[PDB]
Design a binder for this molecule. Structure first.
Ligand code: ZN
Ligand code: ZN
Ligand code: ZN
Lengths: 158, 1461, 69
DNA sequence: CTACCGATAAGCAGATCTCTCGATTGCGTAT
DNA sequence: ATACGCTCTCTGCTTATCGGTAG
RNA sequence: UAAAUCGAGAG
């Protein structure tokens, strides 16, 4: 996935002590893995929640975000680990982290959704939102640009 | 407003001033000390922002006046700021005054004599004696002579003032006009600039420290220099507190009171108040009443006011600094440690800066530091402020808004209102003796039964609501309507019934955007029973620009008789037949009625007696006042045998006969319609319309007859029978055509869009000839001979070269477009109407396209023949980098279709490539449509803001709001634009002589006129003008002025303009036709007397609208941007200046083509073929070889010979090259030519070496002039230089020959006969030399500022009119020269070239106008520092204070004639 | 949603001809035109009433709050 | 040689029709 | 559970500084 | 009862 690669590219961040030259203990803290659980509820054993509940409750259709830290000390001398929750992360319908992912149209009708319900949109506070696709420059291609504003970047600027 | 509550007082003028700290401490009811607004339990804490002494707050009685929240006006408090803080509004002028002051002697660094001179000049300008101000400067002839000079200057000023006051000119309060205001502003600017230019004081010559304002909230003064410190002995960085600045400026202002009395007062300071420097410091803030600081609430969400937050921050900082002051004060009695003093003083300084920043943030957000809360300034400045959002434009009561729907059976002056609006909207009718019949029934009917009543206003002001009442109670109340009052205090008053809107009420209908005044009319109300839409007649759609595509508009209900009469007489929709832009009509039947009348007035239209009579009664019902004779009079049938038949033209004839009033002749009109005689067969004359004696005898009634079109039947009826008759005729014709279409329907279908077999064959044969158009156009552009195959490698190479250039491909896309458009024109000429399967009038597509009902010829051409070339911003379809116009077209394909030529039609569809190109064109059209609306509003806003006060006065001259004269007579003839349509239609007026004589009626207009004097003067002037007027205009001595100058045209018959009189005489001479020329000339002169513009006309607003609204439809700059250059900016730096030069008939075109080459500039680069730089380092060497074109080439193209080029290189080019090289080094320190030379060349080389710096060789091709090689030595230490970009830059800027400010001359094709040279620069002085070729007396120029500079004011004004004229000539838009003349006269009223913007309006007597326009705070500061007093004369000024306008109905008063003394 | 009771243009009752139309199309291998003609729908105003009906109510009926699933 | 009069190169400001809906409204320590 | 500090302008004007005069 | 900002629309 992309979340793991991104959290890997984030890297590590360190900070030293104020007690003994040497600065103290490194504290190489970071995050190694991040996961999104399919949305669930506590009403004992967890039960699957479906977007019909999120729409009728006028609430969000959110799963659970679990980040596992790597609390390292002294350049890897001692490593502690913890799976910290990170609040309710909104999920969009008909995705691999949604409970309507591979449901047949019959099963979609059985769970009140639609005969041919399509996803691509999150539910936030009972309101359905989507994130618009943007047009941006093409990746990894150096394109020549003659732009007048470059001359405004300073004197002696073409 | 309540008409039964008169107000006895009136605000006449307002004046601006500083609110002194002493007065606010006295007016205040309480001061605030605790920056906590309300304590626990929600109660407002005493002494805080919400104090009961500042007003009633949330069901708490005000502690000041003892009144509850409804009746408490509110009271102002204050904040005792611990230190004086700078006023952010006045900070700039305070910083100006702080500099140029001498701390030692407490005077300005300028000498006292010059300061006294400026004071005397300003005092002279206070009384408008601008003449004497400059005569004061003519008094100049050690230490005692200056005192005598000052005494004599003061004596002269006093003598001038006393004489001017005694000589009936001025009163004690001075004369303040625009021009004297401009002179005062100029003098004060020169004064302030001169103060800033001093070295040391001229009364004690000691230097003073130089201040420096880093930003607001802090002023830093630099320390005096060592050398300057010495002078302070021989004559015997640092922060500065606010108190020190206050003390310095207080001392300076106390010393120089006599001089600042005339810098801070534009009028005689009668109060004699001293100008104090405390005015610039707000020692005490003023808190507004709590009524204006209330907290916002939404259910539970309660938020406090932002001004409260700012004031609380100020109070917190004040308490902090007060605590620091106390801490210092305790140590003042017993000092312990100076280090504690150090830290506490640093904290105190930080507190000073913090509280000053708090004040700045409270007043002006942009002056704060450290998105933020808006200040007081931010609440007034821009749109959404307080001037543009709550004073000039407000939200109103008794107004509805709804989506409109069409409705025939509405009288074309009426508005159909829904029952809901009829139930809600109400009018207060005072109960009278004649009214109780209807008002009693209205009260009984109640609020939910139209017509009804919703409220009763008793004499005392009680408002008894009828909503929650039963019928019996309503009868009890109705029986007590006209009961005489029991109270003496109200015995002069009667009750009012807030009755529902009725059928006799008027309503103001408006649809946004209101581009012109006709978009807001007055309609008579008719209430309909069914639906919730405002039903509107079709004729009103022309002015509102309204369709029925869900368009909505606003109905306003005037609530008094004064506004009733205006909407019924002035804003009346009958009065709005002709638009004031050009006098053309804007009312008439639009779409179905035009085709209906084309069918009905045809020759085939025969109607039996029943059909004829039913058609006549269907529109002329003689019980609604539709006819005059009380009995519908009919006509004998056209055909008597075999059975009686009438005709449609006879239907029109009897309609006119019934609507036209009796005791008056019928109309006589000879006109034309839009359908050619060839569309009716051979020998037809139905194209010419002929009304004779009120009977239609020939022609078809069309769009050009009824509709917004000039010189039709409806226009003639309006001119002859008046406006009400024309409106009635419009309504009757609408009903008639509606009833004819409901019995004889009109349809369009697929059969109308087809062509015959021969038509399709013609179209295919012509379009097959287009298979070679694109290739031939490309061959023409590429200069290949002809017949060259499309895949010719040279053709492809040159096509690729053409594509890469934006100019060559600009001519490729113009040449091919012309040929494909010619092919399109051939197709359209061949295939319509000949190739059509169905012919007019059966073909309804052509029937409604020819008649003007809807569509055009290009639309039916696209539908039936082809779409034609698709134009993208004047070019063809864009091209990719690869040279493909589309993926499906090979690169550089020489095809018309590839470039965007659609051969398909909407009948048979278009191919996907053609579909794509058409989508491009449609998208471009939509983008232009969206961007055009946004590009025109600002022009109209700028024009309306300044011209809103300009109006016609009772002197028949037009002048601004404050009285400044702009024109002496509207257009020079005082003729209304909306009443001069038929002034020169002399044959029309002759043919309808008796009809016009019935209305003008001289027999009743003789007791109140002078008839012979104006005629005699006109005869004298005409004789003299005929005797003269063969010589040039400057030679004509003006012995006799035109009659309009002397005799008032509205009071002396015969006093008319010279153009009208000359045209009348020419008409009366050319043709001689029981009407003789004497009676006809008398009738025409009376018509001219009645065609004059009324005093009080809002002429400036009308001119601004007539220049702005037509601007919606919109090598040299052309269009709206050109207007932006002229009106908005008054740019001396015109983007593309041009100059027109006449040509003597002696010169020939062979000389003309070469003369344009003897003036056009020639850069050195235009002849250089190439430049070769041979750099050999190890001193640096350079061989700057310049290879030219052949001598025969540039000696002919530019007429430049070898000698001139060589001299330019020797003198100009090398100097610039060396200068550039030295500059670059300075900024960076961080075939073989013959070697042998002759004798003279060596000496020339030596001279060139000597005159220049680092040249060691030089040579020029003195025999052929095709090369120039010279050396260039630099120091061996220097690093690498480009030495090619330097030469490229210099060569383009080196000049062979040029006339200054002129870059090119052209010889275009003569237009309108006269031969003209057009030049791309402006230099009159150089064209004055060429008398031989150019007629110097006729040099007119596009530049409207250079002509002002060299040819004075009036020539610039004429240029302004002509330039603002031809921008509308390109688009074929009719705007009268009367508007343009007024606009030009307003732009040049000061003798300069003023614009319509903030800088152009910088000088005006009305401060409110300039404040409301833009930059409110700067204008407010200028108005309050000058202590300006405005008389509330601008239209915008009276809105702020709420007074009746000075235009139209507010241009006079009304007096009652009480019979008993 | 459900078949209209009457044709809009003229008012002929066509709500009794929807199940019949479906049965005519289903059992008898008929085209739409012949099935409409057999039902007595002559004018095209009546023909497009049953020819173009979508019968969305069935899709509505599967969402039943009053019965368990 | 030095002080006044301009004469550009650079910096800075304000600015470029009405109407109808819905949705949100902040965090960061300190106690 | 809870209170108070915060990255593609048009027209000018206005400022700083550079040469020339003449004083 | 309020205000901005964002978003969506109508002429
Ligand atoms: Zn009060
Ligand atoms: Zn001094
Ligand atoms: Zn039917």
């Amino acid at each position: 996935g992309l979340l793991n690669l991104g959290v890997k590219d984030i890297g590590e961040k360190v900070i030293f002590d104020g007690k003994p030259g040497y600065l103290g203990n490194k504290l190489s803290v970071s995050v190694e893995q991040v996961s999104i659980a399919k949305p669930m509820s506590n009403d004992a054993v967890e039960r699957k929640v479906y977007p019909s509940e999120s729409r009728q409750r006028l609430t969000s259709y959110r799963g659970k975000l679990l980040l596992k830290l790597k609390w390292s000390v002294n350049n890897g001398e001692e490593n502690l680990f913890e799976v910290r929750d990170c609040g309710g992360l909104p999920v969009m319908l008909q995705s691999n982290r949604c409970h309507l992912n591979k449901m047949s149209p019959y099963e979609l009708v059985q769970h009140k959704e639609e005969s041919d319900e399509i996803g691509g949109y999150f539910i936030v506070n009972g309101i359905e939102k989507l994130i618009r696709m943007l047009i941006v420059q093409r990746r990894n291609h150096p394109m020549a640009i003659i732009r007048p504003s470059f001359a405004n970047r300073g004197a002696s600027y073409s | 407003m309540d008409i039964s509550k008169p107000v006895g007082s009136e605000i006449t003028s307002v004046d601006f001033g500083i609110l002194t700290a002493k007065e606010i401490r006295n007016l205040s009811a309480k001061q605030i000390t605790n920056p906590t607004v309300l304590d626990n339990l929600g109660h407002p804490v005493s002494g805080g922002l919400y104090d009961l002494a500042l007003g009633a707050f949330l069901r708490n009685l005000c502690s000041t006046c003892g009144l509850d929240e409804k009746f408490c006006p509110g009271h102002q408090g204050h904040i005792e700021l611990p230190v004086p803080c700078y006023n952010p509004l006045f900070f700039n002028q305070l910083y100006i005054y702080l500099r140029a002051s001498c701390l030692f002697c407490h005077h300005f660094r300028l000498k006292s004599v010059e300061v006294h001179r400026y004071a005397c000049k300003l005092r002279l300008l206070q009384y408008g004696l601008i003449d004497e101000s400059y005569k004061l400067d003519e008094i100049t002839l050690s230490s005692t002579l200056l005192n005598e000079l000052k005494s004599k200057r003061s004596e002269y000023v006093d003598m001038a003032i006393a004489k001017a006051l005694s000589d009936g000119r001025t009163t004690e309060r001075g004369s303040f006009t625009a021009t004297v205001n401009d002179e005062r502003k100029k003098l004060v600017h020169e004064f302030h600039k001169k103060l800033l230019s001093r070295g040391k004081c001229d009364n004690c010559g000691m230097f003073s420290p130089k201040f420096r304002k880093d930003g607001f909230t802090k002023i830093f003064e630099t320390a005096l220099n060592e050398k300057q410190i010495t002078n302070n002995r021989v004559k015997g960085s640092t922060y500065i507190l606010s108190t020190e600045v206050k003390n310095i400026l207080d001392t300076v202002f106390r010393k120089e009171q006599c001089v600042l009395q005339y810098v801070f007062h534009s009028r005689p300071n009668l109060s004699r108040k001293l100008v104090k420097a405390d005015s610039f410091f707000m020692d005490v803030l003023v808190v507004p009443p709590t009524r204006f600081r209330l907290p916002s609430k939404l259910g539970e969400e309660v938020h406090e006011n932002s001004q409260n937050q700012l004031l609380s921050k100020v109070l917190t900082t004040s308490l902090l600094i007060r605590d620091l002051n106390d801490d210092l004060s305790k140590l003042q009695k017993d000092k312990v440690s100076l280090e504690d003093r150090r830290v506490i003083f640093s904290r105190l300084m930080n507190a000073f800066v913090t509280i000053q920043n708090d004040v700045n943030a409270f007043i002006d957000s942009t002056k704060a530091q450290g998105v933020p809360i808006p200040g007081v300034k931010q609440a007034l400045e821009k749109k959404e402020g307080l001037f543009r959002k709550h004073m000039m434009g407000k939200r109103v009561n008794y107004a509805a808004r709804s989506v409109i729907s069409p409705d025939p059976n509405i009288e074309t002056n009426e508005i159909g209102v829904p029952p809901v609006f009829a139930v809600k909207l109400t009018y207060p009718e005072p109960v009278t003796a004649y009214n109780i019949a209807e008002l009693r029934q209205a009260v009984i009917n109640g609020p939910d039964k139209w017509p009804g009543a919703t409220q009763i206003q008793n004499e005392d002001g009680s408002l008894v609501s009828l909503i929650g009442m039963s019928v019996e109670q309503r009868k009890a109340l109705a029986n007590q309507l006209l009961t005489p009052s029991s109270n003496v205090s109200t015995h002069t008053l009667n009750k009012k019934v807030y009755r529902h809107i009725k059928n006799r009420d008027v309503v103001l209908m408006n649809r946004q955007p209101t581009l012109h005044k006709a978009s807001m009319m007055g309609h008579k109300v008719r209430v309909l029973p069914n639906e919730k839409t405002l039903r509107l007649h079709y004729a009103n759609t022309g002015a509102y620009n309204a369709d029925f595509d869900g368009d909505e508009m606003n109905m306003h209900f005037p609530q008094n008789e004064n506004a009733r009469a205006e909407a019924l007489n002035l804003a009346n929709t009958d009065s709005q037949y002709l638009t004031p832009t050009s006098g053309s009509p804007v009312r008439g039947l639009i779409q179905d009625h035009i085709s209906a009348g084309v069918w009905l007035t045809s020759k085939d239209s025969f109607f039996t007696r029943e059909q004829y009579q039913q058609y006549i009664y269907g529109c002329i019902r003689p019980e609604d006042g539709h006819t005059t004779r009380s009995k519908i009079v009919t006509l004998p049938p056209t055909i008597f045998k075999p059975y009686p038949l009438w005709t449609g033209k006879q239907i029109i004839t009897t309609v006119l006969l019934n609507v036209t009033p009796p005791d008056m002749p019928g109309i006589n009109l000879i006109s034309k319609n839009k359908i050619k005689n060839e569309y009716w067969g051979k020998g037809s004359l139905e194209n010419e319309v002929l009304f004779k004696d009120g009977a239609l005898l020939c022609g078809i009634l069309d769009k050009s007859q009824y509709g917004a079109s000039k010189y039709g039947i409806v226009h003639s009826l309006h001119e002859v029978y008046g406006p009400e008759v024309a409106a009635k005729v419009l309504s009757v014709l609408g009903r008639l055509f509606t009833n004819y279409i409901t019995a004889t329907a009109f349809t369009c279908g697929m059969d109308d869009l087809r062509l015959t077999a021969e038509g399709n064959k013609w179209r295919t044969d012509i379009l097959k000839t287009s298979v070679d158009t694109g290739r031939e156009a490309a061959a023409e552009v590429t200069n290949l001979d002809k017949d060259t195959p499309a895949d010719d490698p040279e053709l492809l190479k040159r096509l690729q070269e053409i594509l890469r250039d934006n100019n060559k491909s600009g001519i490729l896309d113009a040449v091919t477009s012309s040929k494909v458009n010619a092919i399109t024109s051939q197709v359209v000429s061949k295939c319509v109407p000949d190739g059509t399967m169905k012919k007019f009038p059966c073909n309804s597509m052509q029937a409604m396209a020819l008649s003007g009902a809807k569509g055009s010829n290009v639309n039916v051409s696209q539908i039936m023949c082809l779409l034609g070339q698709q134009a993208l911003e004047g070019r063809r379809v864009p091209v990719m980098v690869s040279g493909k116009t589309l993926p499906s077209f090979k690169p550089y394909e020489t095809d018309a279709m590839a470039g965007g030529y659609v051969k398909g039609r909407f009948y048979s569809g278009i191919k996907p490539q053609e579909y794509y190109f058409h989508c491009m064109a449609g998208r471009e059209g939509l983008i232009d449509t969206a961007v055009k609306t946004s590009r025109s509003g600002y022009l109209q806003r700028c024009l309306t803001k300044q011209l809103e006060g300009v109006h016609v006065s009772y002197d028949n001259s037009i002048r601004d709001a404050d009285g400044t004269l702009v024109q002496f007579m509207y257009g020079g003839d005082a003729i209304d634009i909306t009443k001069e349509s038929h002034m020169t239609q002399f044959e029309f007026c002759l043919d309808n002589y008796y009809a016009l004589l019935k209305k003008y009626n001289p027999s009743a207009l003789i007791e109140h006129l002078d008839v012979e004097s104006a005629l005699k003067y006109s005869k004298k002037t005409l004789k003299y003008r005929k005797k003269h007027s063969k010589e040039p205009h400057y030679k004509q001595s003006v012995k006799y002025d035109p009659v309009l100058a002397k005799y008032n045209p509205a009071k002396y018959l015969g006093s008319v303009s010279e153009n009208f009189q000359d045209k009348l005489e020419s008409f009366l001479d050319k043709n001689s036709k029981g009407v003789n020329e004497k009676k006809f000339r008398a009738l025409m002169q009376l018509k001219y007397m009645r065609s004059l513009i009324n005093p009080g006309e809002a002429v400036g607003i009308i001119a601004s609208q007539s220049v702005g609204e037509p601007s919606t439809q919109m090598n040299v700059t052309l269009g709206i941007p050109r207007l932006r250059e002229i009106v908005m900016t008054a740019s001396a730096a015109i983007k593309t200046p041009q100059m027109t030069l006449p040509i003597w008939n002696d010169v020939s075109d062979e000389q003309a083509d070469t003369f344009c080459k003897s003036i056009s500039k020639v850069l050195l680069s235009e002849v250089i073929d190439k430049v070769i730089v041979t750099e050999t380092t190890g001193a640096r060497s350079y061989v700057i070889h310049m290879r030219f074109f052949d001598n025969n080439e540039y000696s002919e193209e530019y007429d430049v010979s070898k000698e001139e080029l060589q001299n330019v290189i020797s003198n100009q080019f090398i100097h610039l090259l060396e200068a550039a090289i030295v500059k670059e080094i300075k900024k960076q320190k961080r075939v073989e030519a013959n070697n042998n030379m002759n004798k003279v060349q060596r000496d020339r080389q030596s001279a060139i070496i000597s005159h220049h710096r680092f040249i060691t060789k030089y040579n020029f091709d003195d025999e052929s002039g095709k090369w120039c090689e010279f050396k260039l030595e630099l120091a061996a230490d220097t690093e690498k230089l480009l030495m090619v970009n330097i030469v490229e830059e210099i060569c383009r800027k080196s000049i062979i020959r040029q006339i200054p400010h002129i870059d090119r001359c052209v010889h275009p094709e003569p237009e309108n006969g006269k031969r003209v040279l057009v030049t791309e620069g402006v230099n009159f002085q150089a064209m004055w030399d060429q008398e031989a070729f150019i007629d110097v007396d006729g040099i007119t120029s596009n530049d409207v500022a250079a002509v002002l500079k060299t040819y004075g004011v009036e020539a610039a004004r004429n240029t302004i009119v002509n330039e603002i004229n031809n921008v509308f000539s390109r688009y074929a838009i009719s705007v009268s020269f009367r508007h343009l003349d007024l606009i030009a006269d307003m732009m040049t009223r000061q003798g300069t070239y003023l614009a319509f913007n903030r800088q152009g309006m910088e000088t005006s007597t009305s401060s409110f106008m300039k404040m409301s326009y833009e930059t409110t705070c700067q204008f407010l500061t200028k108005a309050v520092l000058d202590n300006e007093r405005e008389q509330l004369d601008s239209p915008s000024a009276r809105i702020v204070v709420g007074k009746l306008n000075n235009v139209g109905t507010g241009s006079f008063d009304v007096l009652a004639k009480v019979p008993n003394a | 949603m459900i078949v209209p009771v009457r044709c809009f243009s003229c008012g002929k009752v066509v709500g009794d001809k929807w199940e019949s139309y479906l049965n005519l199309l289903q059992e008898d291998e008929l085209d739409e035109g012949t099935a409409l003609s057999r039902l007595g729908l002559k004018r095209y105003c009546c023909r497009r009433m049953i020819l173009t009906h979508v019968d969305l109510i069935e899709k509505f009926l599967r969402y039943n709050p009053l019965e368990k699933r």
